Amino acid sequence: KVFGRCELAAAMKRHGLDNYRGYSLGNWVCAAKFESNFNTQATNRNTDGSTDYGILQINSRWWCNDGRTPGSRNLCNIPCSALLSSDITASVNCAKKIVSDGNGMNAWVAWRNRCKGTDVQAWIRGCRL
């Protein structure tokens, strides 16, 4: 599913991301825009052999199981395919583990290079929240 911008925020707000570990909701919308273009079926392979999955591009070296990432962990205890659902629940729940790992949102490279320090409230403007 490809979310609309305001529709995504509603989904994120309802699942408890607004101000989760102190990141305002706009940070999470901005990170989804630049990670996946709001497309829940986004996948991207990396040079190490890992793959990033779903609306927040969660990586199979640490976070989910894809059966092809040798030696990797599965810290969210999910198959990477769950991250591709139209229902974002599994993505959000895993995201909350990742941001709580010590480096905050810097674990998302698009966030660090395209959102951090920018006017991220602009991503929720106009929305009925």
Ligand code: NA
């Ligand atoms: Na893995």
